[PDB]
Symmetry: C3
Subunit: 138 residues, 3 copies
Amino acid sequence: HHNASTARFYALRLLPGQEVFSQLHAFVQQNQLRAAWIAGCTGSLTDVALRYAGQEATTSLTGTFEVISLNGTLELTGEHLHLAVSDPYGVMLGGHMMPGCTVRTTLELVIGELPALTFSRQPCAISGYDELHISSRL
Amino acid sequence: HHNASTARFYALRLLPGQEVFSQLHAFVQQNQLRAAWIAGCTGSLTDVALRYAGQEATTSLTGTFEVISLNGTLELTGEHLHLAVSDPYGVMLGGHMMPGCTVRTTLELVIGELPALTFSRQPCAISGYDELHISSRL
Amino acid sequence: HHNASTARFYALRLLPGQEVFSQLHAFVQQNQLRAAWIAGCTGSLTDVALRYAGQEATTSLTGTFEVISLNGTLELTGEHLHLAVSDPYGVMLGGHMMPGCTVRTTLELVIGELPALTFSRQPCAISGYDELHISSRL
Ligand SMILES: [Mg+2]
Ligand SMILES: [Mg+2]
Ligand SMILES: [Mg+2]
C-alpha cells in the first residue's frame, strides 16, 4: 500500500547563476530519489520562468525576486513544482515552475524523500494528463 | 511534554471534482491522525473558497487556479488551513481556507503526522477563540 | 558529509502580541537547535516587517493580516526566513522577514530539526554575503 513512509531529509544550497530545474534534477539523480518533495525553501532569483494557470506558454521574467515558496513533488523522471516570487514592491507572482529560473544570491532547500514509496507519473483518464501515482518502494 | 516528535508521512493525490476540505477530513479519519500538518502541496482548483483576513464572510470564486501553497494543521476534529492560489495572469489571492475548494486536474499532498503528540482546539482567554493545544499522545 | 539527516519535529503556538523573530530565536535557544527549518506555519499578524527584494530598508506595516507562508532555515546564531501575508481583500505581500512581526490571534508552527547536520552562515565569495553552510553534527 502507498501513502505511509518515514522521511529522510537533505539540506542544500544552490549558487548564484545556477538554474533551479537542472540543479534539482541533478540532486535527484545523485541521490536516486524516488519519492521526494520540497519541505522547505528560501532564496532569491534573477530570471524566473512560470507557466500561469491554464496557460500553455511559459512566461519569462528577469529582475530582482525573492523566492517566497517553492512547493511540489519530484523524483527520478518527473516532478510537479509551483513557485511564488515577490518583487521590490512586495508584489507576488505565482505559477507552475518551468526550466529557466536562475539563482540570484542563493537558494536554500530542505528536500524530503520517502524511502517506503515510489512516485511515478501515470496517465489519468479523468484529467487527461499524466498524474502522480504512489506505490510501494518494495 | 509537547512539541517534540518524529513524523510519519503520507502521500496522496486528489481527483478532479473532489472538494478539498472533505477529502482531507476523510483522510484524517481513515488514518485516525491526531497531530498532522500539510508538509507539501501542489495542484489546481476550479472553485475556491477563502475567508480573507479579519472577515466573517466566505468569498467564493470560480475559474482556473493553481495552488501555490496550502499550509496548516489538521487532526481528528479540527484544523486551521490557509490557501494561496494564482490565476492565469500570475496574480495571487490568499486567505483562510473554507469548505468549497474543488480540484481541477489534481491536488498532490504530503501530510505529516506527529505520533508522539495530539492536537486539539481549546479556548484561549487571550484571543477569545479556540486555539491550537499540543499535548502528549500518551 | 552533509545534506542527509532524519528529522525531529516540534509543534508550537505563539500568543497574541508576541513578536515572531524573538519567539523563534527563544525556541531555538531553548532546544539548542543547530539545523532547523519551518516545516509548516499558519496564523495571523497585526504588525508586519518585511524587506522587499533587493531593498535595504525594512517596510513596516500594521493592520489585519493572515500568514500564508513562512519559510526558511534557522539555527542557534542565524536564520533566513521569508514571509507572505494576505490582507482583508485577499491581496498578498511577500519579502524577507525582519524583526517586528507581531502575532494577532495566533501563530501555529511545525519546526523541523536535522540532528545529523549543523547549519552556519559563512561568507560566500560568489554572492558577497554570508550564506548557508551545511556540515555534519559530529
Ligand atoms: Mg502544476
Ligand atoms: Mg486562519
Ligand atoms: Mg532572503
